[PDB]
């Protein structure tokens, strides 16, 4: 199955000199959740900005549906119609004045009619449970509500792929759980999610596949199960496993947990293993 989205040999340097993306290759299978995991400054965001056509690379190419993307204004429209992007700071993509008006913007830019735009806005607001916010002035929104207005704004265009830059940033637990539910729903309607984060916990909750990122390079890539337990490989991008598995592997080091089996992934499963411990 050709990837619905792919990077081949991507190289990008700022007009400073340093290379943000370094001979990068990545494939996004259709329908799955892909975390781009890695520390601050690894150029994960720079990679997202390529994948929706905002940035041109020095070398390499972005493949859409198996076809090399172009740069006609007609070409670039379908690239944005099909690959959506949500920046970290929602205020960088709301120019707004009200929530409804802000979400209307995308549809109108796709050559859609008002009636079609107005319908797209309703679908979007519904899909993100902010329909009652339809007329709230955008500056009078919480941080979380602003991230939900920004996603509603992207999904009003109907992308196949939604790119999310650090989507949980700044959120409390409750806020994280609501967003996770809404994201999972979008994955459920067959939307492909690619998100970048330095939070292994976000990757743990939302990702099917994981790509370890460091200094403009994909360092490793595999099933979320495989990557998030690789204590050794995570160590090289300055990360640790999700807290449950890390403590479970802390239990394994001291021999409390047998090896070659059953790493606890949920917290309660980890508590369940404490019953075997005794003391010395």
């Amino acid at each position: 199955m050709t990837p619905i989205l792919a990077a081949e040999a991507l190289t990008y340097a700022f007009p400073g000199g340093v290379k943000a993306l370094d001979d990068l290759s990545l494939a996004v299978p259709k329908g799955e959740s892909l975390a781009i995991l890695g520390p601050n400054g690894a150029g994960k965001s720079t990679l997202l900005l390529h994948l929706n056509g905002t940035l041109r690379p020095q070398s390499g190419r972005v493949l859409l549906g198996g076809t090399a993307t172009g740069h006609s204004r007609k070409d670039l429209t379908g690239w944005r119609r099909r690959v959506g992007l949500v920046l970290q700071d929602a205020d960088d993509q709301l120019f707004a004045t009200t929530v409804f008006e802000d979400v209307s913007f995308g549809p109108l830019n796709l050559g859609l009619s008002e009636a079609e735009a107005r319908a797209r806005v309703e679908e979007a607001l519904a899909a993100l449970s902010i329909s009652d916010l339809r007329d709230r002035p955008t500056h009078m929104l919480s941080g979380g509500q602003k991230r939900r207005v920004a996603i509603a704004g992207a999904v009003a265009m109907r992308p196949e792929v939604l790119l999310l830059d650090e989507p949980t940033a700044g959120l409390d637990l409750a806020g994280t759980e609501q967003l996770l539910t809404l994201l999972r729903g979008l994955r459920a309607a067959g939307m492909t999610l690619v998100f970048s984060t330095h939070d292994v916990e976000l990757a743990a909750a939302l990702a099917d596949r994981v790509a370890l990122f460091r200094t403009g390079r994909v360092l490793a890539e595999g099933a979320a199960e495989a990557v998030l337990s690789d204590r050794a490989t995570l160590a090289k991008v300055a990360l640790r496993p999700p807290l449950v598995i890390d403590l479970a592997l802390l239990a394994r080091d001291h021999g409390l947990l047998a090896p070659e089996a059953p790493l606890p992934k949920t917290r309660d499963a980890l508590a369940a293993q404490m019953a075997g411990w005794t003391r010395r």
Binding site: Q93, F100, F105, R118
Partner: protein, 243 residues
């Protein structure tokens, strides 16, 4: 903060959703009257008219309205007394129709100031800017205006948080330090506004074009019916006041 004060009342207010054309003929209609109709029978009619709509129509919190309705009073008493005092040959004394003209200025002015306060507290500025669409004013001038209004609140909170920082250190100890402290905030605010503009440029691109910013409002159309009703209650008051 004080920037957002009037703006939230017109954001959160009972008449928030009422049609812009209806609100804006009340405001700009009576306002037109207040400046044209001779003060005594004229301005008083408008004042009670608009004070109705601000309280009969919308229900603007009056404590709030008071707070906003005062500052004018200060600039105002001054004019009234200047009208009252006379200057020339013999020097400085009491003018002939001083109290006549001072009273007339105070009346014409508080009536107009109530009309303005009506728009500001019931209809958001953004909506008014949009209402410029049906006048001939070009789309890019409206768009710049809407986006400015949006930038105002982002910058206002940055200005606020910046004045807090300066204070947290001792930027406001001596008047000397205070003037210079405000100055550094101003100069540091501008690069922040400009980088905001560049970043938005990128952000809006994720949805196709940056510039050319067409947005769909959810404003209701009103009725040629109450605009019929409003249009010569404003010619009712109009001539009952010009007699």
């Amino acid at each position: 903060m004080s920037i957002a004060s009037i703006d939230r009342v017109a954001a959160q207010g009972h008449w928030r959703s009422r049609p812009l054309a209806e609100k804006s003929l009340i405001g700009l209609g009576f306002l037109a009257l207040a400046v044209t109709v001779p003060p005594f029978p004229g301005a008083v009619l408008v004042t009670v008219a608009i004070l109705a709509f601000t309280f009969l129509g919308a229900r603007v919190p009056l404590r709030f309205w008071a707070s906003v309705a005062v500052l004018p009073l200060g600039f105002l008493t001054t004019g009234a007394a200047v009208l009252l005092i006379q200057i020339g040959p013999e020097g400085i004394g009491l003018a002939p129709d001083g109290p006549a003209k001072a009273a007339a200025l105070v009346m014409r002015a508080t009536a107009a100031t109530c009309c303005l306060l009506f728009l500001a507290t019931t209809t958001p500025a953004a909506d008014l800017l949009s209402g410029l669409r049906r006048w001939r004013v070009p789309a890019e001038l409206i768009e710049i205006a809407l986006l400015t209004y949006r930038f105002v609140f982002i910058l206002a909170e940055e200005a606020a948080a910046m004045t807090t920082a300066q204070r947290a250190r001792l930027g406001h100890a001596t008047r000397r330090r205070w003037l210079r402290s405000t100055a550094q905030v101003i100069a540091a605010l501008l690069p922040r506004a400009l980088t905001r503009a560049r970043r938005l440029e990128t952000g809006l691109g994720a949805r196709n074009w940056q510039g050319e910013m067409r947005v769909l409002s959810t404003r209701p159309p009103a009725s040629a019916r109450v605009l019929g009703l409003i249009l010569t209650l404003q010619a009712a008051i109009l001539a009952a006041g010009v007699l």
